[PDB]
Amino acid sequence: DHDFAISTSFHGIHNIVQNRSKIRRVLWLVVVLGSVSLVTWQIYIRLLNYFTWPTTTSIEVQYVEKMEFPAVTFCNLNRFQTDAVAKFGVIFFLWHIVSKVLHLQEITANSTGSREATDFAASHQNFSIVEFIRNKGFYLNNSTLLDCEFFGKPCSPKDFAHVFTEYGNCFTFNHGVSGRGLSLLFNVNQEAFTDNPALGFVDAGIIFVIHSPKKVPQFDGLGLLSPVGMHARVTIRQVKTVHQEYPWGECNPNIKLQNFSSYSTSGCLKECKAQHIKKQCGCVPFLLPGYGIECDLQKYFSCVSPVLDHIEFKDLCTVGTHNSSCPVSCEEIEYPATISYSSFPSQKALKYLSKKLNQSRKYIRENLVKIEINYSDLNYKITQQQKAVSVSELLADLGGQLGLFCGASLITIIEIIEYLFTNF
Amino acid sequence: DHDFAISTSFHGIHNIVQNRSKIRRVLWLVVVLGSVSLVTWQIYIRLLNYFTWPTTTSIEVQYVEKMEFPAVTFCNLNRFQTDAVAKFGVIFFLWHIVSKVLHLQEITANSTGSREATDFAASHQNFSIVEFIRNKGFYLNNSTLLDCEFFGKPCSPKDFAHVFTEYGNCFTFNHGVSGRGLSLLFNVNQEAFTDNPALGFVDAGIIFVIHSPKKVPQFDGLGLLSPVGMHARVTIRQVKTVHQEYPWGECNPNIKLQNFSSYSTSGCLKECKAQHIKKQCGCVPFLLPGYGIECDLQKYFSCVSPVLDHIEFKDLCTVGTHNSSCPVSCEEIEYPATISYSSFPSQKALKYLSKKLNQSRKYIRENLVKIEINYSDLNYKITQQQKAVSVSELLADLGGQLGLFCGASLITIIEIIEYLFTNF
Amino acid sequence: DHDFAISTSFHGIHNIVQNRSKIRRVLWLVVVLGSVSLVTWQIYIRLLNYFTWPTTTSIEVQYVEKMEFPAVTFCNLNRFQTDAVAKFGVIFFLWHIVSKVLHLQEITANSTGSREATDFAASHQNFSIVEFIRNKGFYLNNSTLLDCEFFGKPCSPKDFAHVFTEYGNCFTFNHGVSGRGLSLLFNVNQEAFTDNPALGFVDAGIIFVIHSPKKVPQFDGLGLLSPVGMHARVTIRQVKTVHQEYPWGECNPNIKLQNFSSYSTSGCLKECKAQHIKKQCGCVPFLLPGYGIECDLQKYFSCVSPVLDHIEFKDLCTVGTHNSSCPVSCEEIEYPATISYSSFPSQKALKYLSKKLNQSRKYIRENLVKIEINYSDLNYKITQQQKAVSVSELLADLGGQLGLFCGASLITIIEIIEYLFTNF
């Protein structure tokens, strides 16, 4: 055992053989023990750091000669045609009740409008809200859309897809090279269209949102505005973010949507909502994709509203955090926007448009909206969360801890076998 | 010595023993010397890099289901009640002189208004500016605040705290779940309120700032605006930044504010200002916390203004850099905002509000302001400056330099002792 | 050979000598071979990672008591003086043809305006467009610029430099301490100035851009707007980015502009454009720096427009990517801006300005624009792309791979020489 111990490849062990003295041998053995203990210390420390599943964040600017341009959704701040609602006021409260699925506000059950709506529902249960709103709501034609240009080229209403939202009859664009982009001129027409001030909605103009082609708009408090009588210029850049899985970040790719749709936060949320409503009530609302039987109107007062209140109160639906019901998507793309304004009907131009439209000098300043949406930069920002230590990396670093200390990988094990025989 | 030298644990030393030739021994000794020199080189290099006190910057998106919502401060762009100032024009110049503490502008000493203000100060030294402005300034009641909603729920004036600022009688909100947020409707009332055009302030509307609950608003050129007759929608996200200490960044935690208030850049600045004014003049102005005796009006013309001019000229007060009088705080939270607009008095709604307020159609369009402030995203950005090398890390890396070269930690020292005995 | 092999400094080699058994020697030799193979594996892996030329991205906040303030460029949304154009309508189409160099749009060759412009060009080839526009275009004097203040101090028109752009007669500011900054009051004068609605330009107001002192404005869809009758407040921060060379980023410093001008993306682009036009056509347009002979008017219809169409179609000019004709600059500085508005002519102030300007209560609200531009912080963001591995770094890391495995740098080579002799 002495020959192997002396021949063992270690600085202290070699020193023990060289000095050939009791005090010397003990001192070198102690030095070796301390060095290996520090090695172990470092090892452990660095391994516990890896077992935090640590991350680094990179952020970089990416470029192309011709980028894809995001979809847009437009709505009239005024809902309904004047004529079709003057004699049918209860429609406002009926629509507010139906749109709970979206707006998630609360309505005083004791209010007079609620009583009238409940009476009508009890009297006309065969009435169809969607078939009505799709006809008497905001409409897009030659009468409404005076002009539209994408990239120098003309555009026509037929290019616009149709979507239901809070406001009803919401139209979308570009549905599924720098400084240039989409340009429009709307005739908001406060003579035809109207809304109930009582419920708010006291403001006139165009409301729009910017989203990916394959997403559904949200609106709510996230929707952008443009006023009557001013040209709005909107300059945007694409922004992309990337997330890692549950150990390192919050992404949960494993979750997939019904109908084989690509994952999206909003999608997840609303699909959860629909699942709860259907399972508890057996029907689904009109403002959600065709999961199944559309709910009867009476169910909205009897079933849907209490169910939504319960969902809200119990927090059955959650967003964001890794434990959440609706985790953050792997990748997301946002379109930040900055807005500047200019007086639209120039006095020179005002008479011209007057002539053009055969409209009074009062009407044009009270009804027309011009919008431009433009790409500020042919480059876009990507932000990537990255795993700070791969398995392999651990290996590389593992060796490091030993550095500055007794330099050995197999000698320590070689001595361990020597000790095992020495102890056996 | 030869036995120890031959037995010394080093590649070149082992080669010297193996070859047993003069040329061979010299060649291996030279190779070992070069390897250790490169080791040292690397060592030194990496240590000099550590002694730059280097940093890395991480940036990451953090989540909660219901965040805390920032405080807000509102002011009227028009200062004073018409009635109380029609016969007391000197008040404008008096207030401008008093507000030097804040606005830090310059006033022509030869101007007629300055002469009149100086005469009044010489005649009515017992006059109290603050007791006047708190009564004849902008006020917030049922008459002024037509509506206020926080998160669906009603809000009332009593919820609003009172604060003095440049504009006087500045009211704050929320003083010390997604897409939703605060909504208001002000009656700015250009019949009652007024201001001196001569001094600027030619523009009518609401001025507001967004800040942390526990901070004091700054306004100045950093305040946001909303016009008369348009609904402003303001969409915000919380933004947080973190800084390291003087060796790595600019933070100086050691500095604490009087009255045991948590550190803040602005707070530091203004406290410094107050310290200088008090020590040099023995009094403090009304627009700063109650450090001590409020300054008499005459002191403003005689003492305060020259002192502020001297402070400005001599740069006695500084912000930002680590040497500065007012270093950057450890952590800071900002609220970037994007604004969109829409015509507020819809023709339908205009008659309604007319009726409601018993006001002319002319009055409403030229006096009302609507504001919404909303959280765009239940996630907030944090940016962290981080120390790129810990003490421990140095240890780990220290080892690396030796890598690729004569692999040893204690053998080099072992040979050093062998050389010491060899030389002794 | 046996003595050297046994004496060779390696864990397995030492074990081979110690055990002195065939099975033992083979096992230790295999262990050593596996360890060195893993070493090599790691080595290779990490070297292939280095040969991706990887990068890390830092982003940090930098500070000064008094920063330099960016230049600004202002233009009138209305081009031409009414008087000089009422009898000379063809000027609109002529200018549109000339400005192709900039706007890069398309004009219907069959349009009546095009025919009239072509006839005039065929009739008045000695006509000079630039000498006309510089006189009948937008002008800046006491009549136009009611007020201008930089940092508390007065400013005068003579401070403004003159520049040609799309709009013609574009004036610039500040040409080659916190919250404060530039403030202006323009008289846009829709009585004097005008434009052709037919071609768009239906909107009235001031259009401006923010750029570095030493750059040329671009405008196009990247220009900011301010409306008539509202005070605009613009809050900005400086933003700086840094890029690495072709192996790591996309910067190509080697490219320099003619006339010894510092590199700029836009500059590169336009210089390329001018080079192509001159070489193919032998002349240059007026809206580009004085490369040489200014092109005759007929050339615009005959030569310049087809050449620009060909350039567009063939993609002879490119921006951004490392292969591109116009690579990204080493460093770039941008000025993001956020805008808020307030009703400009307060009813108190309205009469005052009426008196001042001797103008009607109609005229002021229909013609005046007020702008402020301010610095949001005494601090600016820099973003730096950084080479993630230096040559030296490779050395350091090279060692790491060997770590955790047979610990040797020269012993492996020492054994290699032993094997070479063993095989020879």
Chain C touching partners, 3 or more CB pairs below 8 A: A, B
The single residue listed with the structure tokens 């050939």 is A20
Number of domains composing chain A: 3
Structural domain includes residue C324: no
Closest C-alpha among A224, A244, A199, A213 to residue A103: A199
DSSP C157: G
The answer to whether the CB of C382 falls within 8 A of the CB of C181 is no
Rounded CA gap, A236 and A182, in Å? 12
C-alpha dihedral sign at C193, C199, C203, C207: negative
CA pair distance B155, B148, nearest whole angstrom: 5
The DSSP bridge pattern shows strands B193-194 and B80-81 to be: antiparallel
Q: Kindly state whether residue B255 falls inside one of the protein's structural domains.
A: no
Q: What is the CA radius of gyration of chain B?
A: 34
CB contact C172 to A (< 8 Å):
no
* DSSP bridge partners of A72: A173, A210
* DSSP H/E element including A161: strand A161-163
Tell me the two tokens of residue B94.
Answer: 């008096």
Is residue C64 within 8 angstroms of chain A, CB to CB? Answer: no
Question: Measured between CB atoms, does A402 come within 8 Å of chain C?
Answer: yes
- Indicate whether A170 and A306 sit together in one domain: no
| Distance (Å, whole) CA A218 – CA A88 | 28
* Residue A336 belongs to some domain of the structure: no
Confirm if B146 and B187 have CB atoms less than 8 A apart.
Answer: yes
Q: How far apart are CA C191 and CA C207, in angstroms?
A: 18
Mutation site, B404, B406, B411, B412, interface C, largest C CB count within 10 A: B404
Residue B8 covered by a domain: yes
Answer yes or no: do A187 and A252 share one domain.
Answer: no
Closest to C252 in 3D by CA, of C331, C317, C316, C318 = C331
Give the burial string for A377-387 (b: 16+ CB within 10 Å, else e): bbbbbbbbbeb
Dihedral angle at the C-alpha atoms of C405, C406, C411, C417, nearest 10 degrees?
-100
Cα(C289)–Cα(C229) distance, integer angstroms:
36
Considering only CB atoms, B342 lies closest to which of A205, A222, A319, namely A205
List the determination method. cryo-EM
Containing structural domain, residue C26: 2-54+390-423
DSSP-assigned letter for residue B125: T
φ, ψ of residue A175 in degrees (nearest 5):
-65, 150
Q: Pick from C295, C273, C276, C280: which is nearest to C104 by CA?
A: C273
d(CA C401, CA B358): 84
Residue at A105 is within a domain = yes
Q: Do B202 and C353 touch (CB under 8 A)?
A: yes
Q: Judge residue B333's burial from the number of C-beta atoms within 10 Å of its C-beta, 0-12 exposed, 13-18 middle, 19 or more buried.
A: middle
Q: What is Dmax (Cα atoms) for chain A? A: 115
C413 inside domain: yes
The enclosing domain of A256 has a CATH number of 1.10.287.820
How near does any CA of chain B get to the CA of C176, in Å? 25
Q: Tally the C-alpha atoms within 13 A of residue B404's C-alpha that lie toward its C-beta.
A: 22
Residues A64 and A164 in one domain: yes
**How far apart are alpha carbons C15 and A42 in whole angstroms?**
28
- Cα separation of A233 and B408, whole Å? 68
Are the CB atoms for C229 and C362 separated by under 8 Å? no
CATH, residue A164: 2.60.470.10
How far B295 CA sits from the closest chain C CA (Å)? 27
- Give C 85-104 residues with CB within 8 A of chain B: none
Q: How many CB atoms lie within 10 A of CB C14?
A: 21
| Same-domain status, A236 and A349 | yes
Say whether both A191 and A147 belong to one domain. Answer: yes
Burial A331-356 (b: 16+ CB within 10 A, else e): ebebbbbbbbbbbbbbbbbbebbbee
What residues form DSSP beta bridges with C137?
C80
Half-sphere exposure of A244 (CA within 13 A, CB side): 16
- Residue C220 CA to residue A135 CA, distance in Å, equals 40
Smallest Cα–Cα separation from C202: which of B406, A370, B116, A214?
A370
Resolution (Å units): 3.5
Tokens in use for A173?
Answer: 């664009």
CA distance, residue A419 to nearest chain B CA (Å): 22
> Within this chain, do residues A256 and A370 fall inside the same structural domain, yes or no?
no
What is the 8-class DSSP label of residue B344? S
CB spacing of C396 vs B42 below 8 angstroms: yes
The amino acid that residue C360 corresponds to is: S
Using CA atoms, how far apart are residues B142 and B126, in angstroms rounded to an integer? 34
**CA separation for the pair B383, B58 (Å, rounded):** 6
Residue A273: its H or E element: helix A265-281
Q: In what order do the strands lie in the sheet with A239-242?
A: A55-63, A379-387, A239-242, A331-334
CB contact under 8 A, B348 and A197: yes
How many contiguous H segments (helices) and E segments (strands) does chain C have?
14, 18
Indicate whether A224 and A300 sit together in one domain: no
Contacts of A336 in chain B (CB under 8 A): 338
**Nearest by CB: B194 against C9, C338, C348:** C348
DSSP string, B266-284: HHHHHHHHHHHHHHHHS-B
Q: Does the CB of A370 have a partner CB in chain C at under 8 Å?
A: yes
- Helix (H/G/I), strand (E/B), else coil: A152: coil
Query: For residue C246, is it left (φ>0), alpha (ψ between -120 and 50) or beta?
Result: alpha
Alpha helices by DSSP H, C124-179: 129-136
Backbone angles phi, psi at A209, to 5 degrees: -135, 150
Contacts of C353 in chain B (CB under 8 A): 197, 202
- The residues near C378 (Cβ < 8 Å, ≥ 6 apart) are B319, B320, C63, C64, C65, C66, C67, C177, C178
* Pairing mode of beta strands C230-236, C145-149: unpaired
CB B208 within 8 A of CB B74: yes
Report d(CA C387, CA B154) in Å as an integer: 56
Residue C72, SS3? strand
CA distances from A410 to B8, B19, C297, C402 (A): 20, 26, 85, 12
E strands present in C352-402: 368-375, 379-387
Q: Return the CATH number at C416.
A: 1.10.287.770
Q: Give the residues across from A334 on adjacent strands.
A: A239
Listed in sequence order, the residues at least 6 apart from C374 whose beta carbon sits closer than 8 Å to its beta carbon are B221, B222, C179, C180, C181, C182, C233, C234, C235, C236
Determine whether the interchain pair B218/C179 forms a contact, defined as Cβ–Cβ distance below 8 Å: yes
**What is the distance between the alpha carbons of residues C249 and A133, in angstroms, rounded to a whole number?**
54
Q: Give me the residues of B, 291-330, that contact A with CB < 8 A.
A: none
Residues A102, A73 share a domain: no
Question: Could you tell me the two tokens for A125?
Answer: 């249960």
Check if the beta carbon of residue B191 is closer than 8 Å to that of residue B386: no
Rounded distance between C-alpha atoms, residue A109 and residue A94, angstroms: 13
Residues A70 and A173 in one domain: yes
Q: B408 — phi, psi (to 5°)?
A: -170, 150
Per-state percent for chain C, helix, strand, coil, to nearest 5: 40, 25, 40
Q: Answer whether residue B215 is part of any domain.
A: no
Q: Which residues contact B218 (CB under 8 A, 6 or more apart)?
A: B209, B211, B266, C179
Q: Distance from B369 to chain C by nearest Cα, in Å?
A: 10
Do A372 and A317 lie in one domain? The reply is no
Distances (CA, A) of B88 to B31, B55, B78, B85, C52: 94, 59, 16, 5, 76
Strand partners, B379: B63
Answer yes or no: do A63 and C336 touch at CB < 8 A. no
DSSP SS3 for C205? strand
Q: Distance (Å, rounded) from C-alpha A62 to C-alpha A382?
A: 7
Chain A hits for C59, Cβ within 8 Å: 59
CA distances from C256 to A112, A188, C261, C267, C322 (A): 75, 52, 7, 10, 16
CB A239 within 8 A of CB A245: no
For every residue of B174-239, DSSP letters joined together read S----S---EEEEE--TTTEE--GGGS---BEEEEEEE-TTS----GGG-EEEETTEEEEEEE--E
Look at residues B151, B175, B211, B178 and name the one whose alpha carbon lies nearest to residue B375.
B178
Write the DSSP symbol of residue A126. Answer: T
Using the Cβ of A45 and the Cβ atoms of chain B, whether some distance falls under 8 Å is answered with yes
Residues followed by a break in chain B (C to N exceeding 2.5 Å) are 176
Cα separation, C182 vs C234, in Å, equals 10
| Length, in residues, of chain A | 424
CA of B63 to nearest chain A CA: how many angstroms apart?
Answer: 6
The structure tokens 């009074």 sit at A360
Q: Report the distance separating Cα B389 and Cα B397, nearest Å.
A: 10
CA-nearest of A337, A94, A362 to A228 is A362
Cβ atoms of A206 and A225 closer than 8 Å: yes
**Coil, helix or strand for A364?**
helix
Chain B CB within 8 Å of residue A15 CB: yes
3-state secondary structure of A210: strand
Are A202 and A265 members of one domain?
no
Total H helices, total E strands in chain A: 15, 18
Chain B positions touching C376 (Cβ under 8 A) are 222
Burial of C303 (0-12, 13-18, 19+ CB in 10 A): middle
Same domain, A61 and A169: yes
| DSSP type of residue A65 | S
Are the C-beta atoms of B380 and B237 separated by less than 8 Å? yes
Q: Identify the bridge partners of residue A224 per DSSP, sorted by sequence position.
A: A208
How many whole angstroms separate alpha carbon A104 and alpha carbon A171?
22
Residue A205 within any structural domain of the chain? yes
- Rg of chain C taking only CA atoms, in angstroms: 34
**Are B221 and C411 a contacting pair at CB < 8 A?**
no
β-pair type (C239-242, C331-334)? antiparallel
C-alpha B90/C-alpha B113 separation (Å) is 7
As a whole number of angstroms, the distance between CA A213 and CA A335 comes to: 12
